[PDB]
Design a protein around this motif. Structure first.
Motif, mmCIF file in Angstrom:
data_model
loop_
_atom_site.group_PDB
_atom_site.id
_atom_site.type_symbol
_atom_site.label_atom_id
_atom_site.label_comp_id
_atom_site.label_asym_id
_atom_site.label_seq_id
_atom_site.Cartn_x
_atom_site.Cartn_y
_atom_site.Cartn_z
ATOM 1 N N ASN A 1 0.833 -1.181 0.000
ATOM 2 C CA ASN A 1 0.000 0.000 0.000
ATOM 3 C C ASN A 1 0.870 1.233 0.000
ATOM 4 O O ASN A 1 0.487 2.269 0.534
ATOM 5 N N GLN A 2 2.071 1.114 -0.546
ATOM 6 C CA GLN A 2 2.950 2.265 -0.609
ATOM 7 C C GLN A 2 2.300 3.452 -1.293
ATOM 8 O O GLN A 2 2.365 4.573 -0.786
ATOM 9 N N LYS A 3 1.647 3.230 -2.432
ATOM 10 C CA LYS A 3 1.050 4.346 -3.159
ATOM 11 C C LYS A 3 -0.023 5.030 -2.335
ATOM 12 O O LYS A 3 -0.010 6.256 -2.159
ATOM 13 N N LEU A 4 -0.951 4.249 -1.800
ATOM 14 C CA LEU A 4 -2.034 4.822 -1.017
ATOM 15 C C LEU A 4 -1.518 5.528 0.224
ATOM 16 O O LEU A 4 -1.991 6.613 0.581
ATOM 17 N N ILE A 5 -0.532 4.941 0.882
ATOM 18 C CA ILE A 5 -0.008 5.540 2.092
ATOM 19 C C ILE A 5 0.675 6.853 1.778
ATOM 20 O O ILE A 5 0.512 7.839 2.502
ATOM 21 N N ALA A 6 1.435 6.898 0.690
ATOM 22 C CA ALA A 6 2.106 8.134 0.337
ATOM 23 C C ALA A 6 1.102 9.223 0.030
ATOM 24 O O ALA A 6 1.293 10.377 0.424
ATOM 25 N N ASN A 7 0.023 8.881 -0.670
ATOM 26 C CA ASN A 7 -1.004 9.883 -0.936
ATOM 27 C C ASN A 7 -1.648 10.391 0.340
ATOM 28 O O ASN A 7 -1.896 11.593 0.473
ATOM 29 N N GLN A 8 -1.943 9.505 1.287
ATOM 30 C CA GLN A 8 -2.549 9.992 2.519
ATOM 31 C C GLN A 8 -1.593 10.905 3.265
ATOM 32 O O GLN A 8 -2.005 11.929 3.818
ATOM 33 N N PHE A 9 -0.314 10.548 3.306
ATOM 34 C CA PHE A 9 0.635 11.415 3.984
ATOM 35 C C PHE A 9 0.740 12.768 3.307
ATOM 36 O O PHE A 9 0.737 13.803 3.985
ATOM 37 N N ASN A 10 0.790 12.795 1.976
ATOM 38 C CA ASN A 10 0.868 14.079 1.293
ATOM 39 C C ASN A 10 -0.365 14.924 1.553
ATOM 40 O O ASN A 10 -0.255 16.124 1.817
ATOM 41 N N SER A 11 -1.547 14.317 1.504
ATOM 42 C CA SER A 11 -2.764 15.069 1.765
ATOM 43 C C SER A 11 -2.794 15.631 3.178
ATOM 44 O O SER A 11 -3.207 16.774 3.387
ATOM 45 N N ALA A 12 -2.364 14.849 4.166
ATOM 46 C CA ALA A 12 -2.390 15.361 5.528
ATOM 47 C C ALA A 12 -1.451 16.536 5.681
ATOM 48 O O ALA A 12 -1.820 17.564 6.267
ATOM 49 N N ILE A 13 -0.252 16.432 5.115
ATOM 50 C CA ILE A 13 0.670 17.549 5.238
ATOM 51 C C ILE A 13 0.109 18.753 4.530
ATOM 52 O O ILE A 13 0.277 19.883 4.987
ATOM 53 N N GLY A 14 -0.611 18.544 3.438
ATOM 54 C CA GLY A 14 -1.190 19.681 2.753
ATOM 55 C C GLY A 14 -2.292 20.356 3.537
ATOM 56 O O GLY A 14 -2.381 21.581 3.560
ATOM 57 N N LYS A 15 -3.123 19.586 4.217
ATOM 58 C CA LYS A 15 -4.182 20.235 4.973
ATOM 59 C C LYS A 15 -3.674 20.911 6.233
ATOM 60 O O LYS A 15 -4.349 21.802 6.752
ATOM 61 N N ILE A 16 -2.497 20.532 6.727
ATOM 62 C CA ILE A 16 -1.972 21.194 7.923
ATOM 63 C C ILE A 16 -1.787 22.683 7.712
ATOM 64 O O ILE A 16 -2.166 23.499 8.556
ATOM 65 N N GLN A 17 -1.212 23.063 6.590
ATOM 66 C CA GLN A 17 -0.960 24.476 6.357
ATOM 67 C C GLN A 17 -2.248 25.275 6.244
ATOM 68 O O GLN A 17 -2.365 26.364 6.819
ATOM 69 N N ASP A 18 -3.229 24.745 5.517
ATOM 70 C CA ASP A 18 -4.512 25.423 5.398
ATOM 71 C C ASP A 18 -5.163 25.578 6.759
ATOM 72 O O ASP A 18 -5.729 26.628 7.071
ATOM 73 N N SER A 19 -5.087 24.544 7.590
ATOM 74 C CA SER A 19 -5.677 24.644 8.914
ATOM 75 C C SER A 19 -4.990 25.708 9.744
ATOM 76 O O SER A 19 -5.655 26.483 10.435
ATOM 77 N N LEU A 20 -3.663 25.754 9.716
ATOM 78 C CA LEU A 20 -2.978 26.786 10.486
ATOM 79 C C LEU A 20 -3.326 28.179 9.993
ATOM 80 O O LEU A 20 -3.428 29.111 10.796
ATOM 81 N N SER A 21 -3.526 28.344 8.687
ATOM 82 C CA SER A 21 -3.817 29.689 8.206
ATOM 83 C C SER A 21 -5.252 30.105 8.484
ATOM 84 O O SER A 21 -5.508 31.274 8.784
ATOM 85 N N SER A 22 -6.203 29.178 8.400
ATOM 86 C CA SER A 22 -7.588 29.562 8.641
ATOM 87 C C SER A 22 -7.903 29.649 10.123
ATOM 88 O O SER A 22 -8.783 30.416 10.518
ATOM 89 N N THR A 23 -7.212 28.884 10.946
ATOM 90 C CA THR A 23 -7.465 28.925 12.376
ATOM 91 C C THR A 23 -7.039 30.282 12.917
ATOM 92 O O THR A 23 -5.945 30.756 12.593
ATOM 93 N N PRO A 24 -7.876 30.953 13.681
ATOM 94 C CA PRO A 24 -7.516 32.288 14.173
ATOM 95 C C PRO A 24 -6.572 32.309 15.371
ATOM 96 O O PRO A 24 -5.767 33.236 15.500
#
Ligand SMILES: CC(=O)N[C@@H]1[C@@H](O)[C@H](O)[C@@H](CO)O[C@H]1O
Ligand SMILES: CC(=O)N[C@@H]1[C@@H](O)[C@H](O)[C@@H](CO)O[C@H]1O
Ligand SMILES: CC(=O)N[C@@H]1[C@@H](O)[C@H](O)[C@@H](CO)O[C@H]1O
Lengths: 105, 88
Positions: free
Chosen positions: B65-88
């Motif tokens: 499941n290397q492919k699927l796992i890598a995609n989940q990790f990339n997506s999580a790292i991507g949402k971290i930045q958006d969350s930090l910016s939208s969170t007040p």
């Protein structure tokens, strides 16, 4: 926590207002390069190591525990199988001897 | 002023960022080993297979499941930045 390195044991010694811990730690040294692969493909099925890593020294493949070089011949006892060998990336080919065949009981 | 002064810190921000980058490169290329002695390089998928094994799941689960796992990790790292910016 108990010293830098893989911790073995510790001895306490009194001091006028405190303690002095003599941590005994194990530290590796004299490393060496190797070529590796995540799995071996034999008879169409993929093999993985129970403990250790598949390490190649240029021409032969071996299994070795991670923290100290001790190569062994790849056999059915130190590897386990899972599914066919086309899904894994970096799979390699090699003979995986089964010890019951040479005995031929 | 009236006698009150703020002194500067010893490590400037750039040097702290350099220390942090050192820790990241070490952990990405050598896993835990760089903390116990000489840094030993290991392929990153095998390092994550080690850690999967560490939590009691056999490593064949990662190589399949290397492919699927890598995609989940990339997506999580991507949402971290958006969350930090939208969170007040
Ligand atoms: C422990 C060890 O020897 N590691 C070697 C290093 O010395 C060499 O510079 C590099 C490129 O050849 O490959 C690796
Ligand atoms: C390049 C190299 O080291 N090749 C060795 C070979 O000489 C040796 O006979 C064999 C068995 O131990 O292991 C491997
Ligand atoms: C990466 C690798 O080992 N590829 C080989 C492939 O070249 C060969 O045609 C096939 C036949 O068994 O076995 C596998």
């Amino acid at each position: 926590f108990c010293g830098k390195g893989y911790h073995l044991m510790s001895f306490p010694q009194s001091a006028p207002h405190g303690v002095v811990f003599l941590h005994v730690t194990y530290v590796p040294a004299q490393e060496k390069n190797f070529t590796t692969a995540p799995a071996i493909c034999h008879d169409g099925k993929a093999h993985f190591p129970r403990e250790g890593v598949f390490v190649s020294n240029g021409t032969h493949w071996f299994v070795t525990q991670r923290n100290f070089y001790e190569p062994q011949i790849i056999t059915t006892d130190n590897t386990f199988v899972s599914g066919n060998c086309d899904v894994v990336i970096g799979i390699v080919n090699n003979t995986v001897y089964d010890p019951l065949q040479p005995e031929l009981d | 002023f009236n006698g009150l002064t703020v002194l500067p810190p010893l490590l400037t921000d750039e040097m702290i960022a350099q220390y942090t980058s050192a820790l990241l490169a070490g952990t990405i290329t050598s896993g835990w080993t760089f903390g116990a002695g000489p840094a030993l390089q290991i392929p990153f998928p095998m390092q994550m297979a080690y850690r999967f094994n560490g939590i009691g799941v056999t490593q064949n689960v990662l190589y399949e499941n290397q492919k699927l796992i890598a995609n989940q990790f990339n997506s999580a790292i991507g949402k971290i930045q958006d969350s930090l910016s939208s969170t007040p």
